[PDB]
Design a protein around this motif. Structure first.
Motif, short mmCIF file in Angstrom:
data_model
loop_
_atom_site.label_atom_id
_atom_site.label_comp_id
_atom_site.label_asym_id
_atom_site.label_seq_id
_atom_site.Cartn_x
_atom_site.Cartn_y
_atom_site.Cartn_z
N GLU A 54 0.78 -1.24 0.00
CA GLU A 54 0.00 0.00 0.00
C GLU A 54 0.81 1.30 0.00
O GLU A 54 0.55 2.18 -0.81
N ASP A 111 -0.63 -5.48 3.24
CA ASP A 111 -1.13 -4.32 3.97
C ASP A 111 -0.38 -4.18 5.29
O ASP A 111 -0.57 -4.98 6.19
N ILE A 168 -0.64 -1.94 7.68
CA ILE A 168 -1.65 -1.86 8.70
C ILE A 168 -2.95 -1.80 7.95
O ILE A 168 -3.20 -0.89 7.17
N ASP A 169 -3.77 -2.81 8.15
CA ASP A 169 -5.06 -2.85 7.52
C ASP A 169 -6.08 -2.29 8.48
O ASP A 169 -6.16 -2.73 9.63
N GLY A 170 -6.86 -1.32 8.01
CA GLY A 170 -7.74 -0.56 8.88
C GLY A 170 -6.94 0.37 9.78
O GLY A 170 -6.95 0.23 10.99
N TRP A 187 -4.89 -5.76 -1.43
CA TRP A 187 -4.30 -5.87 -0.10
C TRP A 187 -5.32 -5.66 0.97
O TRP A 187 -5.03 -5.75 2.16
N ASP A 188 -6.55 -5.41 0.56
CA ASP A 188 -7.61 -5.43 1.51
C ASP A 188 -8.31 -6.76 1.60
O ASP A 188 -9.16 -6.93 2.46
NA NA Z 1 -6.04 -0.99 4.15
#
Ligand code: NA
Ligand SMILES: Nc1ncnc2c1ncn2[C@@H]1O[C@H](COP(=O)(O)O)[C@@H](O)[C@H]1O
Ligand SMILES: [Mg+2]
Length: 317
Positions: free
Chosen positions: A69, A118, A120-122, A256-257
């Motif tokens: 990302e 990702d 850091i996802d979210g 990547w989500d």
């Molecule tokens: Na994300």
């Protein structure tokens, strides 16, 4: 035809990644946050995790390309400074290698061997000190072979991982040597379904999921939560269905989500499609450009749910 090595690398580095994020969270979050030009946030933690992971991937598999990302295009001097320092805890890179490492994430996917990250996802659930994920997957020709999700705030801190054909598994953030199997729920009536969705109103249509679930006669209210930790709830049986509902036909979900969670739900016995029931096509680049939205379930309830979602959303443009 197995990918033990790719999978052992991912567990290793997702577990450090989690150490990196928990330690970044030990300080006040504001002076560690950047606002991308697109309005989304990104933190000292995202850049630190992505620098460490790309470095470790690149060392171990010098030929694989990475899809990730973040980039360094614009990244304020004082944030970068703190990244650098968090990074040197875990590897000896100078500010040079760090920038070069974060910038390895520019692969366009498609044919051949790609890692999908990702860091850091979210990110919002990270500022929220609630749900968030380090997400790593490995694929070949858009076919997911390995998925790892590290989730430091979910039920004590948990890591789930799967390789294709070999099942799904859960670890503590503290021990990645001893895991247990993990299987989706057995819930066979939609009225008894626990369903989940994003916390952000920009990431999912919560007005229409209300309509869909009310039609499915769902009793319980949605659990709203950030990140791919939603795929991890489906996989371990804590949730039943997971909806991600679009407002138009022009948003394309990032791979990547979705890619790590996608394989983990399928290996744990569930089903993941888009809102029209079509399987996700991870071979068309950096986004799921032939898909619209997400339906992730325990398999039992999938078509029943998809039918009502097709219909509440037949008017997208
Ligand atoms: Na994300
Ligand atoms: N309009 C949108 N629709 C769906 N997802 C989005 C949108 N804009 C951003 N996202 C993604 O949603 C992810 C976080 O989702 P969540 O944590 O479920 O709210 C971020 O990684 C974004 O890339
Ligand atoms: Mg992110």
């Amino acid at each position: 035809m197995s990918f033990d090595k790719e999978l052992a690398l991912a567990l290793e580095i997702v577990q450090v990644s989690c150490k990196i994020t928990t330690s970044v969270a030990e300080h006040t979050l504001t002076d560690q946050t950047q606002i991308k030009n697109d309005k989304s946030p990104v933190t000292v933690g995202d850049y630190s995790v992505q620098a460490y992971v790309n470095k470790k991937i690149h060392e171990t598999f010098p030929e694989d390309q990475i899809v990730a990302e973040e980039d360094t295009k614009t990244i304020p001097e004082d944030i970068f400074a703190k990244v650098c320092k968090h990074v040197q805890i875990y590897s000896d890179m100078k500010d040079d290698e760090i920038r070069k490492s974060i910038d390895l994430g520019n692969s366009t996917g498609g044919k051949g061997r790609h890692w999908v990250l990702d860091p850091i996802d979210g990110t919002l659930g990270f500022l929220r000190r609630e749900q968030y994920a380090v997400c790593l997957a490995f694929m070949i020709d858009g076919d997911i072979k390995v998925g790892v999700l590290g989730c430091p705030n979910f039920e004590g801190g948990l890591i789930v991982a799967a390789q294709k054909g070999c099942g799904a598994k859960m670890f503590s953030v503290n021990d990645i040597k001893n895991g247990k199997d993990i299987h989706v729920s057995t819930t066979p009536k939609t009225s008894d379904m626990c369903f989940c969705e994003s916390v952000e109103v920009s990431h999912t249509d919560q007005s229409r999921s209300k309509t869909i679930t009310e039609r499915l006669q769902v009793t319980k209210p949605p659990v709203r939560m950030d990140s791919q930790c939603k795929y991890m709830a489906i996989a371990s049986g804590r949730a039943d269905v997971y909806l991600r509902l679009p407002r138009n036909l022009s948003y394309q979900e990032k791979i990547w989500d979705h890619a790590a969670g996608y394989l983990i739900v399928k290996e744990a016995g569930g089903k993941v499609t888009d809102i029209y029931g079509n399987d996700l096509d991870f071979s068309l680049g950096r986004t799921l450009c032939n898909n619209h939205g997400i339906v992730a379930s325990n398999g039992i309830l999938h078509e029943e749910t998809v039918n009502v979602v097709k219909d509440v959303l037949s008017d997208l443009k």
